[PDB]
Amino acid sequence: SVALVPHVGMGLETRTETWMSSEGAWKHAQRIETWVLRHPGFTIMAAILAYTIGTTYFQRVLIFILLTAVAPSMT
Amino acid sequence: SVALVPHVGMGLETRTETWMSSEGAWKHAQRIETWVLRHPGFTIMAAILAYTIGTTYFQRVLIFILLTAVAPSMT
Amino acid sequence: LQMENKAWLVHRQWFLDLPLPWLPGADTQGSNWIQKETLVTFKNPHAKKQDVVVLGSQEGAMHTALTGATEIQMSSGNLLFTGHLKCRLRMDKLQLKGM
Amino acid sequence: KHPATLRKYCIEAKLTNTTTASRCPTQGEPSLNEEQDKRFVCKHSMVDRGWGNGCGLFGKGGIVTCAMFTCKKNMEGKIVQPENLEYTIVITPHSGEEN
Amino acid sequence: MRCIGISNRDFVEGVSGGSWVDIVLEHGSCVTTMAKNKPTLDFELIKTEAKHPATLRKYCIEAKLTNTTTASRCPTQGEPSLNEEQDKRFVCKHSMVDRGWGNGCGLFGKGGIVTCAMFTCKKNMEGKIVQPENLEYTIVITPHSGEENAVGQDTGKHGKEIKVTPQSSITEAELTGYGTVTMECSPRTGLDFNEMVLLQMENKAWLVHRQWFLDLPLPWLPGADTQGSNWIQKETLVTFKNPHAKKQDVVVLGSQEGAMHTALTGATEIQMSSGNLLFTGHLKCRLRMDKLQLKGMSYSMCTGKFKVVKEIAETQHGTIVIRVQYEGDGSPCKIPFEIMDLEKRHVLGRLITVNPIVTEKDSPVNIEAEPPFGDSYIIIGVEPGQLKLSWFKKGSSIGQMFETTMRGAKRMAILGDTAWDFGSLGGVFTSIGKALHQVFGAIYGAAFSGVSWTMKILIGVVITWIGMNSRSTSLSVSLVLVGVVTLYLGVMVQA
Amino acid sequence: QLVESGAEVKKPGSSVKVSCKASGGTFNNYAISWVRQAPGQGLEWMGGIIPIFGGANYAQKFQGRVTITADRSTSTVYMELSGLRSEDTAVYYCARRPQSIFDWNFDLWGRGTLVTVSSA
Amino acid sequence: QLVESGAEVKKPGSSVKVSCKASGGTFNNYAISWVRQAPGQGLEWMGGIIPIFGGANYAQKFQGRVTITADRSTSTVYMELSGLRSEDTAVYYCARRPQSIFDWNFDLWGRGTLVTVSSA
Ligand SMILES: *[C@@H]1O[C@H](CO)[C@@H](O)[C@H](O)[C@H]1NC(C)=O
Ligand SMILES: *[C@@H]1O[C@H](CO)[C@@H](O)[C@H](O)[C@H]1NC(C)=O
Numbered sequence A, B: 001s002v003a004l005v006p007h008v009g010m011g012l013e014t015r016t017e018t019w020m021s022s023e024g025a026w027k028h029a030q031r032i033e034t035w036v037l038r039h040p041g042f043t044i045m046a047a048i049l050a051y052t053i054g055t056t057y058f059q060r061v062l063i064f065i066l067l068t069a070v071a072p073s074m075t
Numbered sequence C: 001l002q003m004e005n006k007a008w009l010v011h012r013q014w015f016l017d018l019p020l021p022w023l024p025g026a027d028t029q030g031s032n033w034i035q036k037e038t039l040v041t042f043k044n045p046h047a048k049k050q051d052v053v054v055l056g057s058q059e060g061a062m063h064t065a066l067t068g069a070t071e072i073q074m075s076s077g078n079l080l081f082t083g084h085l086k087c088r089l090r091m092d093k094l095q096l097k098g099m
Numbered sequence D: 001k002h003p004a005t006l007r008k009y010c011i012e013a014k015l016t017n018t019t020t021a022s023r024c025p026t027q028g029e030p031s032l033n034e035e036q037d038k039r040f041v042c043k044h045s046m047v048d049r050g051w052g053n054g055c056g057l058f059g060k061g062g063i064v065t066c067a068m069f070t071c072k073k074n075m076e077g078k079i080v081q082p083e084n085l086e087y088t089i090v091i092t093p094h095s096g097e098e099n
Numbered sequence E: 001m002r003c004i005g006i007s008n009r010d011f012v013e014g015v016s017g018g019s020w021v022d023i024v025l026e027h028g029s030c031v032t033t034m035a036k037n038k039p040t041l042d043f044e045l046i047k048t049e050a051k052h053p054a055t056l057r058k059y060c061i062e063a064k065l066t067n068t069t070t071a072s073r074c075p076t077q078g079e080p081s082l083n084e085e086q087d088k089r090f091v092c093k094h095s096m097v098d099r100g101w102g103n104g105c106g107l108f109g110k111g112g113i114v115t116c117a118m119f120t121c122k123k124n125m126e127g128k129i130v131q132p133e134n135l136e137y138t139i140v141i142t143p144h145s146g147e148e149n150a151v152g153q154d155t156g157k158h159g160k161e162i163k164v165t166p167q168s169s170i171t172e173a174e175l176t177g178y179g180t181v182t183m184e185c186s187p188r189t190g191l192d193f194n195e196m197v198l199l200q201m202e203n204k205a206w207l208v209h210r211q212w213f214l215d216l217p218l219p220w221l222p223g224a225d226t227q228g229s230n231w232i233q234k235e236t237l238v239t240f241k242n243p244h245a246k247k248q249d250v251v252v253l254g255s256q257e258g259a260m261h262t263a264l265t266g267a268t269e270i271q272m273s274s275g276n277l278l279f280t281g282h283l284k285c286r287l288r289m290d291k292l293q294l295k296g297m298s299y300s301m302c303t304g305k306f307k308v309v310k311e312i313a314e315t316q317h318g319t320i321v322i323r324v325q326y327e328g329d330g331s332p333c334k335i336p337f338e339i340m341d342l343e344k345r346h347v348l349g350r351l352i353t354v355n356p357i358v359t360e361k362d363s364p365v366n367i368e369a370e371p372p373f374g375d376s377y378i379i380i381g382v383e384p385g386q387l388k389l390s391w392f393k394k395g396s397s398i399g400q401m402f403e404t405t406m407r408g409a410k411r412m413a414i415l416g417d418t419a420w421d422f423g424s425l426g427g428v429f430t431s432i433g434k435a436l437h438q439v440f441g442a443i444y445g446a447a448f449s450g451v452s453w454t455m456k457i458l459i460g461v462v463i464t465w466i467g468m469n470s471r472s473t474s475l476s477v478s479l480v481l482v483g484v485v486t487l488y489l490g491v492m493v494q495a
Numbered sequence F, G: 001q002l003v004e005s006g007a008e009v010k011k012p013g014s015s016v017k018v019s020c021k022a023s024g025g026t027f028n029n030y031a032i033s034w035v036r037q038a039p040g041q042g043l044e045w046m047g048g049i050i051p052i053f054g055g056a057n058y059a060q061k062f063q064g065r066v067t068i069t070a071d072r073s074t075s076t077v078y079m080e081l082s083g084l085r086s087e088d089t090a091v092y093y094c095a096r097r098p099q100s101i102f103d104w105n106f107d108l109w110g111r112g113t114l115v116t117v118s119s120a
Helices: A027-038 A040-053 A057-074 B021-038 B040-053 B057-073 C012-016 C059-065 E210-214 E257-263 E397-414 E417-421 E428-448 E453-468 E473-492 G024-029
Strands: C007-009 C040-043 C051-054 C070-072 D010-015 D019-022 D040-049 D059-074 E009-013 E020-026 E030-034 E041-049 E054-073 E090-098 E110-129 E137-143 E160-164 E170-175 E179-185 E196-200 E205-209 E238-241 E249-252 E268-270 E282-288 E305-314 E320-327 E337-340 E365-370 E374-380 E387-393 F008-010 F016-021 F030-037 F044-049 F056-058 F066-071 F076-081 F090-098 F113-117 G008-010 G016-021 G030-037 G043-049 G056-058 G066-071 G076-081 G090-098 G113-117
Touching: A027 A040, A027 A057, A040 A057, A040 B057, A057 B040, A057 B057, A057 E453, B021 B040, B021 B057, B040 B057, B040 E428, B040 E453, C040 D040, C040 D059, C051 D010, C051 D059, C059 D010, C059 E257, D019 F066, E020 E030, E020 E041, E020 E417, E041 E282, E054 E090, E054 E210, E054 E249, E054 E257, E054 G066, E090 E238, E110 E238, E110 E249, E137 E170, E137 E179, E137 E282, E160 E170, E160 E179, E196 E210, E205 E210, E205 E268, E282 E417, E305 E374, E305 E387, E320 E374, E320 E387, E337 E365, E397 E417, E397 E473, E417 E428, E453 E473, F016 F090, F016 F113, F030 F066, F044 F066, F044 F076, F044 F090, F056 F066, F076 F090, G008 G016, G016 G090, G016 G113, G024 G030, G030 G066, G043 G066, G043 G076, G043 G090, G056 G066, G076 G090
Parallel strands: E009 E030, F008 F113, G008 G113
Antiparallel strands: C007 C070, C040 C051, D010 D059, D019 D059, D040 D059, E020 E282, E030 E041, E041 E137, E054 E110, E090 E110, E110 E196, E137 E160, E170 E179, E179 E282, E196 E205, E238 E249, E305 E320, E320 E365, E337 E374, E374 E387, F016 F076, F030 F044, F030 F090, F044 F056, F066 F076, F090 F113, G016 G076, G030 G043, G030 G090, G043 G056, G066 G076, G090 G113
């Protein structure tokens, strides 16, 4: 879909507001939140995997965050 | 949009081919590959950040793929 | 889920989480859509004039959203050529013909 | 059989009656009659106002614009009762006899 | 009061030894330039026009499929042949179906099937390109005098708009009673239209990146195309179905207008219905104040009584606008204006409307002034009937310094190195800063292209943590600074 | 550039709604005001509006009985007068003016819609 | 349920296309064969096709001279004959049969299109 390749990081931004800046500013985060709410099972598994793989709490937290963001994004 | 929640991991997959299954099988990987090709500057930064954050080679690589997959799909 | 001339069998929670304006289904007059904000965009370029426009046909985006849903038929009845059925088969009263 | 709808998501809409209301700065948010109409989409924002604009207070005045939301095409999410399913199964005796 | 009452109004003070100041004019923002013994002028870039566009590519957003036809060659005998595969306006697909004595062949394997349908375009998403030469800019220069012109019949008497194009570097604007103002702009560098595309999709237009435009996954035509039927990459808008491997069928995807609108998030909408009008972007201009004159010079001070005909109004820019009217003799005279302290000992305020003058006996002149923070007196007129107006300014000086720093940071965020010549007057420090900014911005844009604000914030947090947990002070400070800047950019980006 | 609705005959106690179709340029740049003139009487200001901003202000004589609205999707401005009476019989004009609070020019005038309050 | 194309009068050396429009059920469930009967001569089988599958087979006499195709969008079957000549004059029929490779029972027929290779 064309919708999966938005025009965000093109470095053309001016002071003028963009097409759906207000709408699309938080839509990705809202989608991730909704997906996490609807799929508590995958979040627990991701947390366990991040704790196991991550040596330190920074590595663990980063791995968990990245896994949780990726799971909806690939879908 | 509505296209960002594509009804993928919902179960209820039978032995009959689903809607747009062939394309959706690899569309996401294709878009990530195209993003990495068009934006090699961020990919190098992700590699450096994963190497620094990662303690073991497996952690480095896992963080690298997670970052490079989130980067395009993040929005 | 029945679109213009195509139908799919989809998860119900997935259907209820779709970010499009919806009617309850008991509405005969419409005119009470719920998430109208998802199909319109309000633009205030700079801080001079405020406008609003619609976001265009969502048919193709919906098709993209339907990947992984099995396509069914809903024109002349709701026909589903997908899925299984578990049956227990009793051969007690079944004999070979012309033994 | 006998499917029942539960939503009628809109995939293509339009807007026909765009209305705007403004209040001079410091005078609080404006209001529109349509802002209580459910067949209308509204949003509150700010615009720059001053002597040139016609307010007289040189600030950011609240502004609200409303447009009538009308649906041109929708997708029906019908449901069926699990008791209304009907599976048709063909049993053939698999003889050499022509079908 | 066009440039008054605009939130994005910026003050520029002083000119270089040559008496020029270079400014960056953005759509939606105005510049008020003021220098000693010079008139205060308001600059507003109000129109950007792109002329003689050329079609680069034509995308298909809605299609129809007809003339569907199938052909099959049963198992082990090769591949089916359709005469439609010779035509490039048919979309074709190959697949296998189960075949046997019942289907119509003599073997019992996976036969070969190909389905072809004729692809037709219903709605287009043309993309046009303009050359930087045909990039006329319109700028309106208004002498910030306290006298304004009612809309209609201005005919350049007060408020002059000048067209800036790459053809002529010098733009002369003759402002009556003020001499001539010479603009010297750089339209070839304001917006890199070479990398831009003017995308036009059904009475809406967007200014998109050329690479992003050419990477769209839709059927398209070369732009040089005339027949309009050899769409390529048609497989992005047509679906091929072989559900159980028993038959093959083709459907077209739905209208991609909404998906395209979603994809256009982050692109500034423009006008392309008639003229290719842009109302976004900036224009860096060098302002020649050499031949500029205060209109009220060689006037005598007004000795008569003044009256305020409209209560003092404070603007968003920390100033106050006072509408006074003269009731005295010697009508073409200059208004005695002062902003003193509560003891009337020191002069605490400055005039934005420098050298206010009375042109007619009963015409209201509205003066904009910058009062000091706290209590002060606005004193208008000579002693016999002198107006003693007391004013209070809410803010503090530290707060104003912080606000100025934040606005400068934001300007460095929307603009790049171009923010270093917004009010520059030569200067070795300015050039050094601009060069360092160019290098750093090159590195940053390389490392953060195609990334959303959430990704920038995450990366900034990660970099800041790496710096905070770094043993070396030099690397620790470098990483912390980079992370702070990246977090700030992610917070300020996507507007 | 300003076109008004045709003359109509109302009845006492009823309401009459008038319109002015500004041709785009008048909208978004200027403001529209409504002035009536009872036969044999001088011009009277009823109110005005900035169609781009919407807020309408009224002469305190007509405040509470008149309504000014603008349709941004049709570039029209409507005037609504309720509680009509014989005295309200007058021609109603709409004129455009700058959005500035100090300039009340009326260069362009509507052709005037006569509103008659009677039975015959 | 099977309707053929109208009468066609052609000239020697040309090519003629004949249209046979079947219903939905006959298009997706049965095969369609082309039989041409020359003036005062017996029936002859030209070829056939499974419209849903679309692979056409022809009599050995008609290799390189007859093309049979189906239009799944309009649910139509066409027969195209190249090198029209005097002996090609005949009536042409489209018949509906099952798609099994053993049963050729034509339980449905059209009405025949007279491809008259002559001048009138
Ligand atoms: C929209 O405006 C038209 C004007 O002709 C009016 O007839 C209609 O009732 C309005 N619709 C609303 C207010 O929903
Ligand atoms: C498509 O089918 C129509 C009949 O509906 C026919 O007139 C047209 O020639 C066909 N086009 C092609 C390329 O076969």
